[PDB]
Symmetry: C5
Subunit: 313 residues, 5 copies
């Protein structure tokens, strides 16, 4: 068929849209994608479908999608076209069509890892419709039809809210008007997992590097094992940790924590080398170095942790 | 076709549901998903299809899905719509339709890892139907049609039971009634694998750390190698072990066992450092520290293992 | 159409089945699945399709699948419904339908890892048919139509035979009679790969641990390096090896070999600790301990290897 | 239908093409593939579809793809045929068809890793059409119809431009004329990630190897630990780094940096072995070797880094 | 439709086949599969479709696949049925059909790793056609229609040739004649990648093991670190390397190189143990052992590399 002609002859047809989240899963940090399963509801007026509720013995009447004109509604930030099962189509005597489908889709939405793993994100789902030559078509948001099931979970996140920006973006694209709505799922990451995956190994590796200051300065190999293994451990943890993220250009909050831990451990190595350098000549100097280090290192590290955890929580 | 009109004019149409598990596989702890292949049986009354059992020499008669109205039944907590092959449709003389399909689906159901790897789970499969404008449709459970084949296996688990909650959850959603049933597969994990994957490496690594107390106090590098490699091994096992799980915030029972093992090993490091601190001056104190440690450590560790394994078995 | 009515009025229709393996691949030990690509041949009698071979100038005549009744044949132990292309349908003058399709499927079959990697398996392909309300349907095996192409290979396995159990298993399921056939692909694993993936690292790691008995007792750190690295290597090989298998409860033959190797290595550690414990006081005892160990350890290890490889080969 | 006959009887029909990038994701360096989601626009002349704009009260008129002849346009460097949803088909009074589809595809395009990770690439998308027996078909580029949305991102790259080579490549293939267009997405890699993934571990590992020159020459085990672990670390980092790339024959810029770092580290090992060789006999020589090394190594390494980072930036 | 009747009443219908490779990708050594995107061209004679070239003013005329009989051509060694888009079907006045499709497929073809990574392979694509009851059908090869695009690449390989074995294998299968063609893609591996992935780490690890002979015999821990870490490095490199291949029974050329390197490294270990054994008593003997070893080991290793690289290049 063709689109409903305008009664005002010059009026845009608006399609009232709503999304109801049923299932939300597979939030992939590295791919910056997530999978969503929801209701899509569309509503518009096609007076061609009007009918007498009495002559037609039905209060509503229901159609197959093949029977009537339906707006071509597409998702933008999706990998493939969604998979949809039309659920219901109900017309009113005045021509008001209420369309309901259930869809699943792989949404592509970029993440801001700067504050990671203390990050919040806005996942976006962009709806769009392209105007035909006979009529311009415009999207709108029916707030009654937006929401999400209570049993919606992302197994590592707190889900804040699912809302829609009511005023759409209308613009020209290849000589036709396109109309775009922005559905926004706000989430904030649950960082605790990482505390025992990365932060604790880091803190313990720093402490372990500091244990070397209490070993006798003459047992040089022992202190060597301490200093060297803690340096290699920091390097391994650093690489491992950045392996969870996409190849982002910037540095994360975890990056800063790991880099400072690497600073403390490598400084313990430099301290061991200096102390070893002054042990025969000027043993008083070496002894003073260890005496001060045993207090300074764990103090600067404690203060650092205070500023860090105070800041990012 | 169209939905069966009510005889009582105000009676909800109930559809009797049953699921019979044929194959159960791919229980993914990290994805919190599993795959199921089963019979779905639905049964309802459409008097329009009734017929005289004597005038018609046939006892049942069978239709194709296109011939008669069939209720649209959806799964809720699933990733894509199921793949189903209709098996049979048999109408009764009184108008009772018995529908049978075989379907496969990827179900998404969250797991409770707090007690892991000594955990039990309830996998859920939610059936749902949305009411039409002409009639409300309500789900119910035919126990004769619920079960699972005996040769059904989840390799890492014991399958306890497959049952259904008979009273459905009926509620309003986007201005129509939905009726939702909760099918429940109860399972409990087989922990033995993990005993030799993680628990043994941990217990042996704690013992290894304790061997250092019997080495000569003067051979500082040897004891250093013992202490340091056991600390790094504990960390490695911690990270490795948590890699099996989704990014849950909390701690598993395995987490507690590993954390206490880390406590014993790091305590062995602190002991080595203390003994080394007193080896030249006050060799009696250092010697006594080794003497007590050699009894306390394996004893406290044995007691801990006793309380832990007594608790979680 | 409808199912072929019985000539004896009470006789079950048997469907003669055959499978011809064309391609066999992706035998996944962890997933307990494999992929199969084969011919499925069915043959039954439908008198309605008989015809005069002389009046009709054709010796066979061929139908389209939509033209005639075809039995619904399903695989049981499969993940999704198979993918099939109907190849040919030939009716005989008497009504004998010979149906031929080519299908691919992902078969789900449990593996018995107890004797692994010296294990044999039976991969199963269960065919099944459900009786309709008009007639009971029963499966049988046409031996002429069972076999496999010679260039069928499972890269890690020797394929012994592909045969079928002629008598089917008939049983009641949800108030109808079902008929189930068991096609059996027998395979036996080629263990050589594992000899150089796991068995050699283990044997050499044990030997390496035994070299420590020949090092000077006064050079404590050297012997520490030997003993400790060999223990951690054994643990690493153990975890690595068990990562190839599903989360089975039991122990494999490889588990036993690795565990005994771990016994030898940890025993060498305990020996080094005893010798070190007796080195200052009672150097004769320490020396005697090493003297005996250098003969006992590699001797008991050789004997063990003799029993092990004699048993599992 | 059939293809439009030529007005000149011997004139090729040109199809004006355009691509508008909507989504660009999953650029896999190892697979040398990327995924694209875009508009494909085609435009050509079919006089059979011309019409009087006055007798027909419509200014454009729109057809279904089944109604009119549409040119078969294929992508060359793609894995499967694209997935396309026809969006709009608009005929003009003169017979000018404006066709618009939205497609997703997995494009296969080779990468030049010689300058990696400081590399720029040209991803190619080849359009092609095969001439029919009735008429030759030739592709062209409608610049109005080429572009890309501003929010297009490759989460690891800077996107320079998306342009088309206007002149197509015409050639004979299996006795017919083919016409091929080259759409080119120019991108350049964001190397910063790799600086902290590989370049820093390498630089620090070289520095660590240099610390050994400041340890007392008599503490041979300590220096052994430094030298040996830094060499093995270089090897591990090399293997890890080359694991991100396809099995390319040549060497990348990163290969060179890692190889020079390996030169410096192995040179420190060779230095330690030489120093240890001369420590008893000719200790002045050994002392001088350390004296010069402490100045030369970090100087040659700093100079090298200066030349390298100056060159590849 | 039906198959073309024979003019000779007893003549087999031949189908002239050709494949033109467009895209060749994803050669998976472990899966022994590769993906191909190509033209499939078929050509046969159906007199029923003939026409007068003069009365009919048309030189060819074109049909839709539904209009005429088309032979069912299947690939044998493929995982799923191919995905094909029919491109063109052109009949000649005499009745010669020229059919052209573009298909993609996942081909399964076994590899011979004995000479790896210096291996050449023949990837096979088997075409096959099954005879119908009315006529025997036989495959043949049209060389004009066989080839590959010049920009066809398998990263990590040299593509030698794509040819066909002209004489097909005709044989009986389940009581009908099948006709099978062997298309052969010859390739040879580019080993250079492996040179820097495995061969260099091995060679340098052997050299590193030899450095121990130049360290002072009294620094037992130092030599212990050398010998032990190099032995474990060899084991790790071995396991890593074999992880790239399927679970083949035999040994590759790379296996032999790695095994000889392990021999040299373990022999250096045995030498260190022997030298350490004779260091107190008979220092002349130990000294002589190091003196000879420092020349023999690197010499025998140089000769070995000479024979090996001379052989496999
Ligand atoms: C100039 C003389 C007198 C002193 C020579 C010693 C310096 C060369 C050392 C001392 C502290 C070292 C720094 C300690 C910490 C780091 C953090 C490290 O960053 C990371 O590891 C990033 C990890 C991540 O991003 O997750 C980079 C090297 C750097 C700057 C080191 C550079 C070399 C430094 C300056
Ligand atoms: C000055 C000397 C005398 C005492 C200083 C030593 C303390 C700082 C040590 C003693 C016990 C240690 C604790 C022992 C065990 C743990 C558990 C450990 O947790 C895990 O490894 C988690 C593993 C998992 O969850 O899988 C984190 C470090 C911690 C808190 C250690 C923190 C540092 C502690 C308090
Ligand atoms: C003689 C006294 C003074 C000191 C020894 C204390 C014992 C408690 C030690 C000595 C030998 C140890 C055993 C050495 C070998 C192993 C094999 C180990 O099994 C595995 O590693 C499983 C590997 C796999 O299954 O893949 C389990 C611990 C166990 C029994 C150890 C348990 C603790 C033992 C008995
Ligand atoms: C003269 C004697 C007394 C001692 C020196 C023996 C040589 C044989 C050493 C000195 C420098 C070494 C080279 C140092 C650096 C390299 C680059 C190295 O390349 C890499 O491993 C980088 C990894 C990558 O390419 O990604 C390969 C070994 C090699 C050629 C080494 C080969 C062995 C060499 C030539
Ligand atoms: C005091 C003297 C007589 C030595 C006594 C110890 C022997 C038992 C050692 C010395 C040399 C060793 C051999 C040195 C090298 C190897 C190669 C090794 O092969 C591999 O690692 C294969 C790796 C791969 O296939 O990739 C198998 C063990 C073996 C034969 C060793 C077996 C044990 C041997 C004979
Ligand atoms: C994270 C940086 C640590 C810096 C610690 C400086 C300690 C100075 C000790 C000097 C002793 C003479
Ligand atoms: C909310 C959990 C934070 C855990 C980290 C607390 C900071 C510990 C610092 C230890 C420094 C020695
Ligand atoms: C869970 C915490 C375990 C810590 C063990 C402490 C042992 C102290 C022994 C004191 C002997 C001197
Ligand atoms: C199936 C139960 C396995 C539990 C194993 C407990 C072993 C405790 C060892 C403690 C050694 C100190
Ligand atoms: C795996 C069991 C090894 C047992 C070796 C016994 C050696 C006894 C040596 C003690 C002599 C006093
Ligand atoms: C990349 C190669 C490093 C070469 C450094 C040589 C240093 C000179 C040592 C002088 C010894 C007396
Ligand atoms: C192919 C196996 C190589 C083994 C190398 C042994 C070299 C022996 C040298 C002994 C010198 C006394
Ligand atoms: C084609 C490149 C082959 C590389 C062979 C390197 C051989 C080095 C042997 C060194 C022996 C000491
Ligand atoms: Cl969509
Ligand atoms: Cl020492
Ligand atoms: Cl569903
Ligand atoms: Cl099936
Ligand atoms: Cl395409
Ligand atoms: Cl095929
Ligand atoms: Cl050491």
């Amino acid at each position: 068929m063709v689109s409903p002609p305008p009664p005002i002859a010059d009026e845009p047809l608006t399609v009232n849209t709503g999304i109801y989240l049923i299932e939300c899963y597979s939030l992939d940090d590295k791919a910056e994608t997530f999978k969503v399963n929801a209701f899509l509801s569309l509503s518009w007026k096609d007076r061609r479908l009007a009918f007498d509720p009495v002559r037609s013995g039905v209060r509503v009447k229901t159609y197959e999608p093949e029977a009537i004109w339906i707006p071509e509604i597409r998702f933008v930030n999706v990998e493939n076209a969604r998979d949809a099962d039309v659920v219901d189509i109900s017309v009113s005597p005045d021509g008001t069509v209420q369309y309901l489908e259930r869809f699943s889709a792989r949404v592509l939405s970029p993440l801001d890892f700067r504050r990671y793993p203390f990050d919040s994100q806005t996942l976006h789902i962009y709806l769009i419709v392209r105007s035909v030559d006979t009529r311009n078509i415009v999207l709108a948001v029916d707030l009654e039809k937006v929401g999400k099931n209570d049993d919606v979970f992302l197994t590592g996140w707190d889900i804040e809210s699912f809302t829609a920006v009511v005023k759409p973006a209308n613009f020209a694209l290849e000589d036709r008007l396109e109309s775009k709505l922005d559905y926004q799922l706000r989430i904030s990451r649950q960082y605790g997992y990482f505390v025992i995956q990365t932060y604790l190994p880091c803190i313990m590796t720093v402490i372990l590097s500091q244990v070397s200051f209490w070993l006798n300065r003459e047992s040089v190999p022992a202190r060597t094992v301490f200093v060297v293994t803690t340096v290699l451990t920091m390097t391994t943890l650093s690489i491992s940790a950045r392996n969870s993220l996409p190849k982002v250009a910037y540095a994360t909050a975890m990056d800063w924590f790991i880099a400072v831990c690497y600073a403390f451990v490598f400084s313990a190595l430099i301290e061991f080398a200096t102390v070893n350098y002054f042990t025969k000549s000027q043993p008083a100097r070496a002894a003073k170095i260890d005496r001060l280090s045993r207090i300074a290192f764990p103090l600067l590290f404690g203060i650092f942790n205070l500023v860090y955890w105070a800041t990012y929580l």
